[PDB]
Amino acid sequence: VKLLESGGKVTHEGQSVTLTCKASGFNFKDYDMSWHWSPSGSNRQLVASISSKTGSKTEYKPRIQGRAYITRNNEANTVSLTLIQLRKEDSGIYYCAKLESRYIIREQWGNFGPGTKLTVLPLEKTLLTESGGGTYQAGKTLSLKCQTSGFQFKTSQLDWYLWTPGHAPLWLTGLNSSSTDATEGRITSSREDNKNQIFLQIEDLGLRDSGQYHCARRVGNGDDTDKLVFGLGTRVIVEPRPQAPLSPSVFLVRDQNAVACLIRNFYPKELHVSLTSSGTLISAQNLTLAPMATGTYSAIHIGRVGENDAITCSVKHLEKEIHMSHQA
Amino acid sequence: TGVALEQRPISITRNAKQSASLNCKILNPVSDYVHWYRSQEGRAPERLLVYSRSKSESVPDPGFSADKVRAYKGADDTCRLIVSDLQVSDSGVYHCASWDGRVKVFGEGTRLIVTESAFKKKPPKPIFFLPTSEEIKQKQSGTYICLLEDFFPNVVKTYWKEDGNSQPLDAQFGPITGGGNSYSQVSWLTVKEDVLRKNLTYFYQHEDLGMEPKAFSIS
Ligand SMILES: *[C@@H]1O[C@H](CO)[C@@H](O[C@@H]2O[C@H](CO)[C@@H](O[C@@H]3O[C@H](CO)[C@@H](O)[C@H](O)[C@@H]3O)[C@H](O)[C@H]2NC(C)=O)[C@H](O)[C@H]1NC(C)=O
Ligand SMILES: *[C@@H]1O[C@H](CO)[C@@H](O)[C@H](O)[C@H]1NC(C)=O
Ligand SMILES: *[C@@H]1O[C@H](CO)[C@@H](O)[C@H](O)[C@H]1NC(C)=O
């Protein structure tokens, strides 16, 4: 009639899962129930079967013999639960069936449902915990650290990779079972064999050095099929170093449909910009602030107005005050 | 080094249960293998599969099934990753990678966007701002500004070049702002007096443009 299995989730290797199956529309006591498993599609295999009305004959398959337990709730429910030996290969679609003749043979188990999606993900024994992220002034020295766990640290190859949005992941430096690798000058790496830690040291920090730093471990068979196992990484933002307060240069551009207010070479980064047409604010205006390699900030305030209109860009970046106006 | 990975296009947008194909052109290949790593927001980057060239064999990593991710041969130097029956949980940045001895080289990546919503995919509309004489006077330098507005999806790649130098200039890019079906990005480039009055060119790559970039000539 209507069998609806409801269990399964996204768990990790070495977890527990309990699968339920609501059976509606027939006398639950008389008939026996069972659970099936299919890797991705068809080829359903009988993995568990329970007898009639909280029966006495519950038989498991050698696949889950010692980590399974099937039970039934006579209020329209059947439960199968897998123990903490739950690996990744016993993951897929599980179905719920009900048993349902001399010269006419039928299929022993029937009335399957849509199944339930159980996805067990593998659990990595390689643990990498990056620390040392934050905001740094330019010219300072960055020093990152990784706590490693779950592998032979002494004979392992561990690297530092720089992940920045829109850019290709870039290898900075690393270590192996030998002496310093690319460990001369700005980008440097070291290790502490006692606490199983690897370090990164970048000197004379620049704006280009911002990004997400991951320490990575090379695992595999030693050939080009090896993979890199990454940690969550730690984020590093670089700010301009403190310097003398510099007032900005303001300019005004047009493109017959928009207005760009150009604010160049100011410090600190705190300012207020506003674009006015006739004493009022213009339709749209969004600010974009960015620090230059010269050590100061620049900003652009774009808006849209007509070409035969008056507009005024007002810039307040200290005690000082600046107004740029184009008449009609 | 010398190894170079090229991934076109920069972004792929699909609805659920559809399929997606990602390309990886390898120039000067040292390793016989192409690795496909995935970057998802919040979790560490991990490898999906390793494709063997000359064997045309895709070996997925534990946790990924061959009926979900599988690499093939594209052109005579392209590795083609196909991700089928897309769910929202497939969204991420897919990078191809190759070993070069002890160092591993990655591509800039391809963002896969899988949404349960209908989308429009509109191309960027650029407006430019040329340097003013006042700036060249009181700063001895000119600033070019380009505003890409009202594009979807929110993935664009822009760069500036100088006519004859095959290396993009150092410009400033703002974040990709916007929402829904309209995103925008601003970028500006400041050049000196001795670099002014030299024909510039501006490029931007978007999903709604294909694999070739759109070019703009500036003077
Ligand atoms: C352990 O790490 C060290 C340092 O990374 C490795 O030594 C380095 O190996 C690379 C190649 O694997 C050498 O660079 C090569 O130079 C040639 C000539 O320019 C170039 O054609 C290659 O593409 C490559 O760049 C490098 O000289 C060498 N030494 C360094 C960097 O100090 C070592 O192989 C690693 N493995 C061990 C020791 O088992
Ligand atoms: C400013 O942001 C709004 C957000 O809706 C956008 O519509 C507008 O186009 C942006 N301004 C410009 C000049 O693109
Ligand atoms: C720059 O473009 C102009 C187009 O008016 C052309 O006459 C000039 O030759 C170009 N410059 C160079 C160096 O080719």
Chain A residue closest in CA terms to B11: A166
CB B107 within 8 A of CB A168: yes
Closest CA to A170 of A233, A126, A98: A233
Ligand 3 atom at minimum distance from B164 CA: 13
CATH of domain A2-121: 2.60.40.10
Q: Nearest CA to B70 among B89, B79, B83? A: B83
Preceding omega of B62 cis (within 30 degrees of 0): no
Asked if the Cβ–Cβ distance from B172 to A233 is below 8 Å, we say no
Q: What per-residue string of b and e applies to B61-71 under the rule 16 or more CB within 10 Å gives b?
A: bebbeeebbbb
DSSP annotation string for A182-250:
S-SSSEEEEEETTTTEEEEEE-S--GGG-EEEEEEEEESSSSTT-EEEE---EEEEEEPPP---BPPEE
Residue B107 Cα, gap to closest chain A Cα (Å): 5
Residue B219 burial class via C-beta count within 10 angstroms: exposed 0-12, middle 13-18, buried 19 and up: exposed
User: Residue B162: which of B129, B206, B198 has the closest Cα?
Assistant: B198
Judge contact between A226 and B34, C-beta under 8 A: no
Which of B192, B209, B202 is CA-nearest to residue B135?
B192
Q: Are A324 and A303 in contact (CB under 8 A)?
A: no
Q: Are the beta carbons of A158 and A150 closer than 8 angstroms?
A: no
CB B172 within 8 A of CB A265: no
- Tokens 């790496």 appear where? A189
Q: Which two tokens stand for residue A127?
A: 């643990």
Q: Could you tell me the two tokens for A32?
A: 């026996």
Please say whether the beta carbons of A70 and A53 come within 8 A: no
Q: How far is CA A301 from the centre of its chain?
A: 33
The CATH classification of domain A127-239, taken from the options 3.40.640.10, 2.60.40.10, 1.10.540.10, 2.40.160.40: 2.60.40.10
Decide: B128 and B216 in contact? Cβ < 8 Å.
yes
CA distance A118 to A68: 15
d(CA A141, CA A162): 16
Superfamily of domain A249-326: Immunoglobulins (2.60.40.10)
Cross-chain CB nearest to A171 (options B104, B107, B170): B104
Instruction: Sort strands A10-12 and A116-121 into parallel, antiparallel or unpaired.
Output: parallel
3-state secondary structure of A297: strand
Q: Residue of the nearest CA to atom 27 in ligand 1?
A: A181
Smallest Cβ distance to A257: which of B33, B127, B135?
B127
A150 Cα: distance to centroid of ligand 1 (angstroms):
27
Q: Residue A297 has which token pair?
A: 């900030």
Residue A174: list chain B partners with CB under 8 A: 102
Based on DSSP, count helices (H) and strands (E) in chain A, helices before strands: 0, 28
Q: In three state form, how does the secondary structure of A142-157 look? A: EEEEEEEECCCCCCCC
* Shortest Cα distance, chain A CAs vs residue B23, angstroms: 15
What's the start-to-end Cα distance of chain B, in Å?
A: 36
Q: Where are the alpha helices (DSSP H) in chain A?
A: none
Give residue A277's identity as a one-letter amino acid code.
S
Please report the atom of ligand 1 found closest to the CA of residue B2: 23
- Chain B residues whose beta carbon lies within 8 Å of the beta carbon of residue A240: none
Cβ atoms A265, A292 nearer than 8 A: yes
Reading the block at residue A279, the tokens are: 């004493």
To 5 degrees, how large is the angle CA B54–CA B58–CA B60?
150
Q: Which of B8, B145, B127 is nearest to A251 (CA)?
A: B145
Amino acid letter, residue B68 = K
- The number of C-alpha atoms within 13 Å of B3 and in the hemisphere containing its C-beta is 24
Tokens at residue A95, please?
């179905």
B174 touches chain A (CB under 8 A): yes
Rounded to the nearest angstrom, the minimum Cα separation between B154 and chain A is 12
- Method used to solve the structure: X-ray
Determine the Cα angle at A132 with ends A126 and A134, to 5°: 130
- Domain limits, chain A: 2-121, 127-239, 249-326
| Ligand 2 atom closest to Cα of residue B147 | 14
B4 touches chain A (CB under 8 A): no
What is the 8-class DSSP label of residue B120?
A: -
- Expressed in Å, this structure's resolution amounts to 3.1
d(CA B63, CA B189): 45
